[PDB]
């Protein structure tokens, strides 16, 4: 237990139902990474499927503001995601330490989260439970978003940050009887924290779940008179309470505030960039390791979240 | 070492926003209780009449299957209220801790949630957000109903938790966008605890809320080999989608089940007796420890809840 394959495991910083997460350290190019730790012999069948197909979702998100995956250690009893270490904690417990942010600073997260929910919607990812779990800090005050349409079962908090932490951004028509699945769920979320950012506080909440119920569905909230018109313009495009009426993301990356200060630099999709496997400084590197050519250019072909891959990426952190 | 009125302070053992628990020793008695103490110097003046109106609401439910009051003390900033002490937790992590219970045992406890629930009901008071915390058990495994009526405000759960545990209990029509305010809600709660007392599990589950709200809403639950004929059809009694169709409380009391073994005993609604304030024998020795007959007769008669009545009634325990 003080290793795992090329990483030596450092402090617990989180133990769940099913899952630890471990701090730890690669030993090839010494980076700091976090180690999820998902016990395989504590799940039927079902479940087993489910995580398999998370993870890879997992593989597919490439974002640089979505936490990404680096390796995968499989044994007949463990599964080991080595991911992205976000070392700044969650959005809104900054803004309960901190208070607002100014417009400036706000605009700047969430044009981040738009383009990092944007990217998981386009590829037909949506996740329907945001909270405040899901959005992370890193070091240097970049937005990570953190398992995004990837199942509670397999977090630490589990269920219960659902239960506990999803009503005051679930979209209204979660109260209404009908479906709730498509991407206008996450959009009306979007909204919630957007309002969290400027204002330092929920805009919809209750003391039990008929009174949150009562203000989701009536939809009415506070403008606090620092709050500029042109934000508060940007907040009826999400915050809309018939899902047909709401704005798309694409279309709302072209707003006067989310692109103010950035006249010359409009948010649009994120485009991925194309992925160089066949950078020789670094299989250089490599090869002073041990790794063959061959290898190399097999694992980083196959795209295989071995060894290899990992430490080519790493490599180029 | 720390009193307040005829208690001896003892451990703390809630720790709310706006309200601690202790446990206590009256000292005349022996006897022990638990004390929920409130500042109100944190309260603005619309909250403290809240808390009022509900110090009022514990003054006439009087069951033996709910949480009883039996002193109140109040100082210029701080509220006393001194309550029956259940030692035995949490109805739901006894279940988690031990298993399901047989068919016989769980009869028991339910005809006490049942007839303490009713009780409420007669009165007008509907809880509508019935928790694993609302029902405990005390050191003889009899049910206390606790927090009946009463807002989070004022109760240990802390401050951002409100929503953690009411899902699962929670009726479909939260999730239809319909009134939720009758007493047919907490008719769907109870059936929910039926099937918890007896399988040891919840009949609704969901690793998020979109995901229990989905299994709410279509209303089928598994029924285990083990469960009888009678208790699957007196879970179907409460377990109907349709708020009026779901049936009463009055009329379910009649139940198959709930009576197996109570022949010359059918469950029917409470019917509080008249309280024996003449009891020689406990006037005796009160007078022992220094009250005069006379302002006895008026604190029990007027029902004063002062230091008078509860040593009255902790005599009687």
């Known amino acids: 237990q003080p290793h795992i394959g090329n990483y030596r495991l450092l402090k617990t910083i989180g133990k769940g139902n099913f899952a630890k997460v471990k701090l730890a350290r690669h030993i090839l190019t010494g980076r700091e990474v976090a180690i999820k730790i998902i016990d395989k012999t504590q799940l039927n069948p079902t479940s087993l499927q489910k995580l398999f197909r998370e993870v890879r979702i997992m593989k597919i ?25 976000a070392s700044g904690g969650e959005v809104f417990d900054y803004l309960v330490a901190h208070g607002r942010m100014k417009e400036k600073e706000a605009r700047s997260k ?3 989260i738009v383009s990092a929910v944007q990217y998981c919607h386009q590829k037909r990812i949506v996740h329907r439970d945001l909270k405040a779990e899901n959005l992370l800090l890193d070091a240097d005050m970049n937005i990570k978003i953190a398992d995004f349409g990837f199942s509670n079962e397999f977090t630490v908090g589990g269920k219960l940050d659902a ?13 209404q009887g009908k479906k709730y699945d498509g991407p206008e769920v996450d959009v009306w979320s979007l909204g919630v924290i957007l309002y969290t950012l400027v204002s330092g506080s929920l805009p919809f909440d209750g003391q039990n779940l008929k009174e949150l119920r009562e203000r989701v569905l009536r939809g009415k909230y506070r ?20 899902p047909i009426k709401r704005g798309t993301l694409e279309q709302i990356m072209k707003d006067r505030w989310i692109n103010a200060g950035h006249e010359e630099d409009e948010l649009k999709p994120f485009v991925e960039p194309e992925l160089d496997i066949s950078d020789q400084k670094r299989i250089d590197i490599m090869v002073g390791m041990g790794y063959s050519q061959e ?20 490599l180029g952190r």
Chains 1, 2 share one sequence.
């Open 110 to 112: 969430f044009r981040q």
């Open 295 to 314: 290898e190399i250019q097999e694992s980083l072909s196959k795209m295989k979240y071995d060894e290899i891959t990992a430490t080519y990426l790493l």
């Open 61 to 85: 998100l490439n974002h640089p503001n979505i936490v990404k995956l680096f390796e995968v250690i499989e044994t007949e009893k463990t599964l080991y995601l080595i991911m992205e270490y």
């Open 223 to 242: 403008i606090p008179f620092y709050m500029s018109t042109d934000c508060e313009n940007l907040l009826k495009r999400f915050l809309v309470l018939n």
């Open 163 to 175: 239960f506990c932490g999803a009503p005051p951004y679930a979209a209204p028509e979660l109260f």
